[PDB]
A paper describes a structure:
Through optimization of crystallization conditions, we successfully determined the crystal structures of CsAlaDC, CsAlaDC-EA, and AtSerDC at resolutions of 2.50 Å, 2.60 Å, and 2.85 Å, respectively. However, the corresponding loop in CsAlaDC is disordered. Upon superimposing the active site residues of CsAlaDC apo and CsAlaDC-EA complex, it was observed that the hydroxyl group of Tyr336* in the CsAlaDC-EA complex exhibits a substantial 60 degree deviation along the Cα-Cβ bond. The superposition of amino acid residues in the substrate binding pocket of CsAlaDC and AtSerDC revealed that all residues are identical, except for the substitution of Tyr at position 111 in AtSerDC with Phe at position 106 in CsAlaDC. The results revealed that AtSerDCY111F acquired alanine decarboxylase activity, whereas CsAlaDCF106Y completely lost its alanine decarboxylase activity. Among these mutants, only AtSerDCY111I exhibited a marginal level of alanine decarboxylase activity. These findings indicate the essential role of Phe106 in the selective binding of alanine for CsAlaDC. To identify the amino acids repressing the enzymatic activity of CsAlaDC during evolution from SerDC, we analyzed the crystal structures and the amino acids at the dimer interface between CsAlaDC, and AtSerDC. This analysis revealed that the amino acids at the dimer interface at positions 66, 97, 110, 114, 116, 117, 122, 315, and 345 are different in CsAlaDC and SerDCs. The results demonstrated that CsAlaDCL110F and CsAlaDCP114A exhibited significantly enhanced enzyme activity compared to the wild-type CsAlaDC, with a 2.1-fold and 1.59-fold increase, respectively. Our findings indicate that, following the excision of the zinc finger structure, CsAlaDC became insoluble, while AtSerDC displayed a similar trait to a certain extent.
Ethylamine (EA), the precursor of theanine biosynthesis, is synthesized from alanine decarboxylation by alanine decarboxylase (AlaDC) in tea plants. In this study, we solved the X-ray crystal structures of AlaDC from Camellia sinensis (CsAlaDC) and SerDC from Arabidopsis thaliana (AtSerDC). CsAlaDC and AtSerDC are Group II PLP-dependent amino acid decarboxylases, which exhibit numerous structural features common to other amino acid decarboxylases. The overall structure of CsAlaDC or AtSerDC is homodimeric with two subunits exhibiting an asymmetrical arrangement.
Numbering used by the authors:
A (entry chain A), B (entry chain A): 62 to 69, 79 to 481
The structure:
Amino acid sequence: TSLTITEPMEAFMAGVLVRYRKTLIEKTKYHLGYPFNLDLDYGPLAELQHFAINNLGDPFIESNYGVHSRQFEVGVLDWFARLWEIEQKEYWGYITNGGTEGNLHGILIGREVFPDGIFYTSRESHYSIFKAARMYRMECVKVGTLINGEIDCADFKAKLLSNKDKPAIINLNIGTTVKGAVDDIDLVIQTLEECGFSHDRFYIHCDGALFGFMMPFLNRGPKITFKKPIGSVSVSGHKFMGCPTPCGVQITRLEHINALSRNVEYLASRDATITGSRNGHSPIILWYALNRKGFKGFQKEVQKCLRNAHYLKDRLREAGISAMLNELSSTVVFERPLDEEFVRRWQLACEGNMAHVIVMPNVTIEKLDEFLNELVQKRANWYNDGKAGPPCLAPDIGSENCDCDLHKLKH
Amino acid sequence: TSLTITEPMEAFMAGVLVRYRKTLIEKTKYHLGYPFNLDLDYGPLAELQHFAINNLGDPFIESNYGVHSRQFEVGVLDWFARLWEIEQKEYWGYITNGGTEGNLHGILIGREVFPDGIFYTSRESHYSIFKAARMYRMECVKVGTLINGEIDCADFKAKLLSNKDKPAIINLNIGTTVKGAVDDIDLVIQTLEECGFSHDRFYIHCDGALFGFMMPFLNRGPKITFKKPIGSVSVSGHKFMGCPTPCGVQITRLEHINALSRNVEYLASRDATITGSRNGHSPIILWYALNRKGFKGFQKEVQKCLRNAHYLKDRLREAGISAMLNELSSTVVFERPLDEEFVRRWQLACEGNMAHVIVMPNVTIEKLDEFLNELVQKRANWYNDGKAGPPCLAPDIGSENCDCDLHKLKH
Ligand SMILES: [Zn+2]
Ligand SMILES: [Zn+2]
Ligand SMILES: [Zn+2]
Ligand SMILES: [Zn+2]
């Protein structure tokens, strides 16, 4: 709970670090709950930990602080711009400290385009989104959600129509935290158009912390492209790509950044970021990864993760455990384990009667089998004899996906 | 300007990293302008770059994500609480991604204590402060500054008195960016009291990005202590202590955090941070440093830096170069070099007619001599023959510190 700092040792401290490394190997082995790629292969870059790298200021305007990684950073941003179909001279962006910063930036951009804008996001938006709205003092209208976690564009439509006067700022979830739903970009855009909102009276941010990275590697789904009238897209680098430290990529339209960007004389750069000092090792790490693997290495990794999710779901239903997997998802929602020591061991994320597993590149079939074997074994003790019987997840995941004493019958 | 990412190499990429390491050694050698300690000695911790460490959530409430460094983080926060004289059960805080996040958090805390609060900060506050005020939609009253960069408590008094009705939220600069001034905490507090503001109608944040760390190691100055009615203090970890990546420490009063802190079920933790995912290598790095050096190692390092600043200033005045150093400062303000290739080589920060050198632990007498020898040599070419004569820095640093053709006479 605390490692106290005492006054002057190198055997004590190397003792601690040996012990600690041990626990991190254990934790890394059993981690299944959170969307972090734990297969980190950046051993050559670790030398660079000798430098105080700081990308302080604009990625595209070099500051007087010379210990930076802008060549890498700009490399990576260009790749992301290509990925989301925006040209060099149409886009601006930066490597962030994570999905939260991408969301704070994107929503702030939208506010500056439309200071009077009403803000809309689904009920299953990440907590960062509602935090942003409160930080920024924006009126937030929570939009309903279908069973699977997608924004409800009928409820969206309704809500739009009762604020016809004002501009709409929208956050769309490309892979919701709990259920792994993907908001229908195309349908949201259509709904705006047929409610009388033209491009120049709405701003959309796409929160793609995990799945915004993954979706472009599939042939399907509501493609993320600035050929459509979206404003900004963020992803998290420590989620799908994998990074020792949290990071992200935020990409917007250049015309949008002018309202945030101010000159700062003592930097000889501009400030258009949430942050000041910025992590300059992240850009190198992500550059390294993009180069080694390319679009075809990432595609493979994405496809294997969807397959491994499919597999886990199948085995759970087979075991008569309520479980759901959305079409565009590596997140397997399932009946929350009753044993909370079990939850803590596999580091499961839980909400109400749901838990979930996120099938990151590190998450192998071998590991899923270990997991299932343990789950099925312990589960036998939870709902048998005169005890309750499994919870009903039909309200959360649909009755088609529920295997309680009632809904299992209908399959 | 860009290192393009191409599709599949390990000789090309290790070629790039050899080249790049070279430039970072060069940059590290000549860096003088920014407040980053470049003497990083954390080579043993670099193994830990193999792990996706994430302190996601509250430092004091463990989340279900197990790959974290809370033992280290909490260790470090406790040390900082001791340092600023606040008890375990009176304080909350976290390790941030830098001084900007500390400021965003602190100012946001103050807003939640006083939603109607008028916000006050000096004209020489960091850009993060004015950014925060705009992000948060807070009315910001810029307070004047004495020549040396300290907040002007007469102008403060005046400004307070014309907003007697509303609470006061104040940012105080403990080491302003450009001039290295320290706002007079004690005098600000007195001014509030004699203007009719009792403790429970003002909130103070101390921005101590560089000097909040350094000041406690001196026997003098407006001591930073929660025994006085301050609300929150931030420092930057990559400034004085030194860290490969930007980080910081934000420490507030526990009673203050309740308004920001919300439970997040899927984490099994609380969200009271600006961020979500948080860097978990930083806490280890700062823990390592605090343990190896202790209060007595840091004191020594602080004292040497003040001495080396004193030295640089003296040699500049000797060379008839306008220069100033505040009493509680390692930042040497001086006539801005006319040669902007020279500015770029020593990575100097510049504002108007001022440049500055920040004497971080890495900045040795040997290095300062190299610098001065070059400066004096080139300067001989700038203001001689029929050309202008040096600029006057008296408006910026005081006529006592100016060595232009006019003010040098009066000394
Ligand atoms: Zn199937
Ligand atoms: Zn059911
Ligand atoms: Zn002297
Ligand atoms: Zn003068």
